[PDB]
Amino acid sequence: TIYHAKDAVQATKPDMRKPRLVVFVVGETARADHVSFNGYERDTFPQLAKIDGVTNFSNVTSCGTSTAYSVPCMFSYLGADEYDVDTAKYQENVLDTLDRLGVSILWRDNNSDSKGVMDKLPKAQFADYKSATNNAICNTNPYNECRDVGMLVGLDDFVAANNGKDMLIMLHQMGNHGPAYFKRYDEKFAKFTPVCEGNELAKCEHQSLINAYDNALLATDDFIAQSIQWLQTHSNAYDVSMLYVSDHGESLGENGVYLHGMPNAFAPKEQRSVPAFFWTDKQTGITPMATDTVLTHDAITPTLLKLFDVTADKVKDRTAFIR
């Protein structure tokens, strides 16, 4: 292991102040420009719109254009300019640090896996929610695909087992993963019709492709809202907050490009312009940065440290999503 934050210290501890409980939704394939709050023509986040204390960040650029590249970068100490995907798994990352400091780290995954981020931590702290052995919400559609909201079931059990400790829960979404956007949401979210249902996306009618994509965002709006509602059930005992950031965007036919994964050197803007949301309860004292702050995935690690009152010199200078 190559360390970067052996100096990290937690300035206040959960025996001397309210324990802190944070959900970090690690999003998938969502584009900033399809978010209502960023000026999109459709109301793709109706439920998040009803919740007080949500900040939408309108200028966030991902570290890369794929899950394998972006996800380790989101938790890295090195920042986009120095990040090396090929050695990321041997670097101390922000979850390693928080775990060393006693913060209970949980990682539930309805996407693939943590792309190496959790590899140094006990395997019991990672749970596969793509399978009904863990996920109780899979038989709600014709494909029997486990839904992101199932990652919230049994979270009370985890909180009860970590009573009084600081907790950081990562929920790795299936989200808007393509090509089969139409599979990504239950029928209650099929608001925009007709929808593309083919694997050759260039052969779908463009509007029908957009419709499937936007319906998948409605299901993610629901999942994020439900995550906040779950946190709210613990707000008297815990200082609760929710961070959402997508791993990358998506091309939807611009210049004949589909899906993602374009190398950064020529990646179109749509693959790197991602949404970010931050919610916190009024008791926590956490203050969001300005909604239009120029931000990147580099802001994630200092945000997670600040949420737990941790300082590490490697990122002391670094802009976060919060003050």
Ligand SMILES: [Au+]
């Ligand atoms: Au991804």
